[PDB]
Symmetry: D2
Subunit: 330 residues, 4 copies
Amino acid sequence: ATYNYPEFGAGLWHFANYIDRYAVDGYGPALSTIDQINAAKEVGELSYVDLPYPFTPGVTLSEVKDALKDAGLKAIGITPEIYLQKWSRGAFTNPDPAARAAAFELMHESAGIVRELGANYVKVWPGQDGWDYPFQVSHKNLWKLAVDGMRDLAGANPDVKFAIEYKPREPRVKMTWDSAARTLLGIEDIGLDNVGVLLDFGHALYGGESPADSAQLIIDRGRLFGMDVNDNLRGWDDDLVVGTVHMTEIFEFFYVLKINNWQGVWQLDQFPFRENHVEAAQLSIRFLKHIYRALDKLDIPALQAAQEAQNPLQAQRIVQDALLSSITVS
Amino acid sequence: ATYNYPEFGAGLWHFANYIDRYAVDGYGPALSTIDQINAAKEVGELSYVDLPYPFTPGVTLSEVKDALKDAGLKAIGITPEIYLQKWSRGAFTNPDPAARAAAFELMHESAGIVRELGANYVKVWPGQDGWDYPFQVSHKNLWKLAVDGMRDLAGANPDVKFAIEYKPREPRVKMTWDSAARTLLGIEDIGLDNVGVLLDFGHALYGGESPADSAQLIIDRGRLFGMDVNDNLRGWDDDLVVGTVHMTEIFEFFYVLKINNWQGVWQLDQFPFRENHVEAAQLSIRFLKHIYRALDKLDIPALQAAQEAQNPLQAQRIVQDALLSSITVS
Amino acid sequence: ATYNYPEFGAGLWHFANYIDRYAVDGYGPALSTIDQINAAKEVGELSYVDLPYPFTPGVTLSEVKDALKDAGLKAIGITPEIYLQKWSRGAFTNPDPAARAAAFELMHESAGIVRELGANYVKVWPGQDGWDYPFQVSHKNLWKLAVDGMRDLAGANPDVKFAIEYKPREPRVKMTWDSAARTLLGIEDIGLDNVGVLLDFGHALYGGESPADSAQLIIDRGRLFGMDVNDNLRGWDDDLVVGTVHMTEIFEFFYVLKINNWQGVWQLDQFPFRENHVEAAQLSIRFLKHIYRALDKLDIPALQAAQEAQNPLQAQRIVQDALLSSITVS
Amino acid sequence: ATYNYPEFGAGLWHFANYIDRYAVDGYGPALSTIDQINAAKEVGELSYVDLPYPFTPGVTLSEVKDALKDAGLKAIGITPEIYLQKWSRGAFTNPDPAARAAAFELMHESAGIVRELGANYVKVWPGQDGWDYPFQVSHKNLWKLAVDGMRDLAGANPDVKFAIEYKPREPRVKMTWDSAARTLLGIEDIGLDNVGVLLDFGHALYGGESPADSAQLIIDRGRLFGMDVNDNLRGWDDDLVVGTVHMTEIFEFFYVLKINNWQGVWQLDQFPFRENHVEAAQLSIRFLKHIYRALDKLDIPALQAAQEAQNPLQAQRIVQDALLSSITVS
Ligand SMILES: [Cl-]
Ligand SMILES: [Cl-]
Ligand SMILES: [Cl-]
Ligand SMILES: [Cl-]
Ligand SMILES: [Fe+3]
Ligand SMILES: [Fe+3]
Ligand SMILES: [Fe+3]
Ligand SMILES: [Fe+3]
Ligand SMILES: [Fe+3]
Ligand SMILES: [Fe+3]
Ligand SMILES: [Fe+3]
Ligand SMILES: [Fe+3]
Ligand SMILES: [Mg+2]
Ligand SMILES: [Mg+2]
Ligand SMILES: [Mg+2]
Ligand SMILES: [Mg+2]
């Protein structure tokens, strides 16, 4: 058996070392944008990365281009870092209009970086936008800032795609763009063709969604601009290696992409805090290749017949037969 | 101080005795629709009930009209019982087309009952519609049945309002109409003016929503047809007496209704399994009256100024000053 | 390859038809204890059942013995129905002392049934014991009733084992015996050798525990009297077919049982509400047989070496190699 | 009315600025230990702080003593920082024995600081101890390291109390000392009189416990060495200002402390990321003073009568009458 595997990608931050409110001295040394690209190269199966912007201090666009070329990598997305201290109280939704304007300027500049690097989208994740307490915000006004600010950004760059990465929460207690459905509602309201969704399987999962259903819902609106995969224990954005907890639902997610003829980079968004980051990516790709092989074995017509009958026993037996196929025989 | 309190209502089932998968012999004796109306009368401050339909065996529409009249109650909604054994595998989404048709006939008949009783809406809660396992359903086809079937029902009855009561889950592992945002998306797809939302505070809460924000979002689309209140511990539809766990967030919910000038019956949807059902309703009304008085005391301009600043400490101080006002000074 | 598979069992209720607060007319017709035993026979690989007591109306102990014999089944446990209407406000913890006494009498009688049927244990699940609201109970006095009442029961029957099935909640908002750790604390307080634990994988899972760790903790105290398995989405006791959502963690559970040489019936506690109940049990057994074969393939020494290093990437690689082995190569 | 209010305290980190994996440049400038003590002074009602150890770079014990004296503050606890990069893979449970030894040395030194400052306890919070993936650890061996390491520490310092702050998780996916009950089990196993519990109301709440019950359970074992309060939305350690979400359950927690004659510092453990930290503490103390006044008004005999009857309606009516007393009338 021979397979034409999907192209794989990762957020560049898969190869950064992290920091949290406890290990304030970091989970390893600070790595530059260039160090992170060199790390992604070591994985040996990636074709794309999503690069945060601005790059680390001192790193230029020319240096990034060179590192990417030497790594055999292309930029799939550019993620403006609209969640740093400057925007700790919001980017689109900062109470300070000057802060909102500065956020726009960074995101607008990031669309230029997308043009320069031939990336697919500006990946918009406004992590500091939302609320921490009941009564902290006017719900009407907060959501208006979110939607209007997004429209302003996208409207100023009609030639570039903006992929909104919804997330239930973190760092806020509740984020503005919190679910697939609310994101699609917001997209309707914005009214622009160049705004779509970055569907993070893990975000959907711990948000209580069926990630497979969310993929279908978004695809049905023509708004699935990209995906991210990882795993978690359904309570938080744990950002674990894909396939280590929820094999079945991850398989369902890829099944829905398959039947909808949705082609895209299979993209990792994972944070291997305490692990070898390169090896974490490698294990992830091994599992994803298994998923690809399992999709080939899956008896789709039999599954769909079971689904028409809504017989979960038949559906699960068919799915297990494909998924519980040998990973060690590739 | 003197107050013109809101009109209060309850689901008629607030006065039924329940049954679950363990206490299969029930939490008390079976009470007829008429017995339930007579119990609702005992509360002493209800003006409306939402009546399940069909009525209990042998009970006629004429008997119901007489009992409601004598009890000082009007029907605010009629809830077709589309979640009984016949539709245990779905109403709109049953795999058997004949079952789907039969559900339509009942719901269509319930629209007639709404006309006869002058009720505001058919209250649509398709509790058996959804899935229990990953891979059990075609998500595309399941949602299409849900939306198309709702359109068929509402389109056949343009003079009657249909309020969709979204709910995360139960009795299914996941219900079709599972959130405010998805419901609004579905309403846009249906494309009819007579379809709206029954927002149950408790469903929003355990669904991970800000109930206040959901109210605002729905009101912004002109689709808030009614409300249900209760409390829970945010993990399940516990259907506890309102104000016993989450006083702050229920106050926020009513605050949003107030600032939008949303006028409508303050409706209880509670299941006092092991309590005196009449006294549970009475305690709920006492709390709602406190909420109403607290809303009158609330410094709304100062709150809104704090919200513009997104200062949660100022917002909470103002809220606490109103909410912690004496309940024994009525 | 040839395997000596574990003996399989199920709660007899795996073959009952259910009822809930919505489908009050049931998910199917009422089946007698004898009908349930006859259905269990159909599965074709069960050796044991756990029987609720009292049996359904009119069914005698002699009839049960004959049906079990003819079905090829033995009683592994007897479950006194201490959660029916009589005890809807508690069994051990009922506020009415006469109700507490009546619960004792039933449980004491069930110990006799265990003697008569040669079962391993009285399976104690005090589902109605706990609380629904903050402030409803004296936590000190509630827990004292729970512990002292359990001591009274077990102390009166020193020759019989009592397996306490802990569970987070349902039908109460919180149950007394709510976790592995609390149960072990209670067992230490009771101070009797014949009180242990029925560890339900699904209860542990939606309770936020690592079921594997709970198994180890209980085994370390010599208190693992039996197991129940099923699956869920980690928010509720969904009681789905085992292996349909959390294959990795159920494999870990059985792995812990294996390395501790815990020998005991692999017991299903599942509620196939809307499915063919016999085929649900069959699919469950097929999966458990896969688990057994996967445990034989698992490189336990390499896993344990990875665990000493706390390297999750190595651990998961090893686990996946075993678990993803072919299910259709039996 | 005149009140002798409880002594108030806060973790010193209530006055630090924070950092997370997104705002890696921090939520404000780095404040030294001394700056934080000066901040605590500004609150104007604190008597105690819990100080992390080591102090910030360059800060000496002599300087801390001087700052504390000038602030009118005493050290209630010392928190060894066993969750920094060095111990990012565990303190007691690090796979590297050298790391475990270094953790012991820091904690042992911190017991000396407790002696010097006359603090009540070494506050032990081993945040990096636990696991991130299923199968990552030997559950038996991991828990053995946790218990044995704690015994080694406490046994080496029999004159000093060690308060274990249990927490469900964060930064790990699951922490070793994860619940009140498991902590009490561990304490039994350690077998030393100087090991007890720091009960964080928020940790109990998002762990699914009744914080009030947990307080009772721990007090019944004589192990409640201290408390921490804050609030959250039950899904995560949000560390919000106390009383902003769950007034009722916080009241219940203090009620249980009251009836058990448990006297201690009312201690805040909150992280006002985006707020004025001093004002956050001030609002907290205002709410806690309200709680104290409400406890004075509470009709405890009537409540306890309701609790004996397990009547939650009566219990809640009595509680509301006390809690919903005017906060603005002190
Ligand atoms: Cl698409
Ligand atoms: Cl409206
Ligand atoms: Cl054992
Ligand atoms: Cl104590
Ligand atoms: Fe992502
Ligand atoms: Fe993520
Ligand atoms: Fe409702
Ligand atoms: Fe409900
Ligand atoms: Fe069970
Ligand atoms: Fe169960
Ligand atoms: Fe704390
Ligand atoms: Fe905390
Ligand atoms: Mg094919
Ligand atoms: Mg049609
Ligand atoms: Mg006694
Ligand atoms: Mg007094």
